[PDB]
Amino acid sequence: ATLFIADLHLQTEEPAITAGFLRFLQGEARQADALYILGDLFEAWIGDDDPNPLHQQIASAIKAVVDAGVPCYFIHGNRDFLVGQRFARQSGMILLAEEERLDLYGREVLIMHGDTLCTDDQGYLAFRAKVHTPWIQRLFLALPLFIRHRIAARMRIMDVNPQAVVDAMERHHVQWLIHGHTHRPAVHELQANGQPAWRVVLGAWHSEGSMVKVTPDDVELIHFPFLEENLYFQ
């Protein structure tokens, strides 16, 4: 099976989500053919030179999955668009483009974070265009770390446009799309390329975890607890 997760929004102040993700990496992920992280792995990112200990803790845990034979892939979210090749090397992850078409057991599947499908929010899309401009990213990353941290602290949900969904699935000629961003886990039926098509949405990790599991036989949207919930009787 191939696994998809997104919208964990990991951060120091939410250790329960981190512990849930570490358990996921040490258990479920080790049995997978591959693990894809469709953006918003971290609640914030100001560059790969950040000494935040959580970053190294997460990189080591993902690296252990990769070393166990499970390739891991990352598409950027709107929270963590500055994740770069240094973190890719630390974690063993492979960075992918904003849209990718996958062969999953003979099923062609488009994957993306999902924010680019929210074409009704033109203000957001203009902000996105600016922070994805390479010369702007370069200038921001050149600032001292302490300045970047102040900017980020100081700076501290839209849904998809149905026609943007059809356009993306016809551009890639797929009948299956998996994304996150909207935090509304669901399976939507539509029509694309003259045939029934499906859009599968991941959940954010709020109280419990969420993943999509693709097998040769089906597509599974799965909700599971962060920790081992030991039975006990009354």
Ligand X SMILES: O=C(CCCCCNC(=O)Nc1ccc(S(=O)(=O)N2CCN(c3cc(Cl)cc(C(F)(F)F)c3)CC2)cc1)NO
Residue stretches of the annotated binding site for substrate: 78-79, 121, 181
Binding mask of the shown chain, residues 162 to 201, with x at each position contacting ligand X by CB under 6 A = -------------------x-x------------------
Partner in contact with 137, chosen from ligand X, Mn ion, none, beta carbon below 5 to 8 Å by kind: ligand X
Is 28 a binding residue for ligand X by CB under 6 A? The answer is no
CA distances from 12 to 7, 17, 49, 147, 200 (A): 15, 10, 17, 19, 29
Question: Least separation, in Å, of the C-beta of 158 and ligand X?
Answer: 7
């499906």: which residue's tokens? 198
Nearest distance in Å: CB 91, ligand X: 18
Q: How far is the CB of 112 from ligand X (least distance, A)?
A: 12
The answer to the question of residue 116 lying near ligand X (CB under 6 A) is: no
The order of strands in the sheet holding 107-112 is 100-104, 107-112, 176-179, 195-201, 186-192
Instruction: Give the CA distances from residue 148 to residues 45, 168, 177, 225, in Å, rounded to whole numbers and listed in that order.
Output: 10, 34, 35, 35
Give 104 or 111: the residue with its C-beta nearer to ligand X: 111
Residue 223: enclosing H or E segment and its boundaries? strand 219-224
- Close Cβ partners of 18 (under 8 Å, ≥ 6 residues apart): 10, 54, 57, 58
Q: Which does 94 bind (CB under 5 to 8 A by kind): ligand X, Mn ion, none?
A: none
Nearer to Mn ion, 80 or 192 (CB): 80
Q: Encode burial over 92-123: b for 16+ CB neighbours within 10 A, e otherwise.
A: bbeebeebeebebeeeebbbbbbbbbbbeeee
The yes or no reply on residue 210 touching Mn ion (CB under 5 A) is: no
Contacts (CB under 5 A) with Mn ion, residues 70-109? 77-78
Site string for ligand X, 122-161 (x = CB under 6 A): --x------x----xx--x----------xx--x-x----
Name the binder of 152 from ligand X, Mn ion, none, CB < 5-8 A by kind: ligand X
Does residue 199 belong to the site contacting Mn ion (CB under 5 A)?
no
The site for ligand X, by CB under 6 A, has a size of 19
The phi and psi torsions of 167 (rounded to 5 degrees) equal -60, -45
Return the axis-axis angle of helices 122-131 and 134-142, rounded to nearest 10°: 60
Give the angle 177-178-184 at the CA atoms, nearest 5°. Answer: 120
Report the residue count for the chain: 234
- Which one among 5, 40, 55, 109 touches ligand X, defined by CB under 6 A? 40
Residues that bind ligand X (CB under 6 A): 7, 40, 44-46, 78-79, 82, 124, 131, 136-137, 140, 151-152, 155, 157, 181, 183
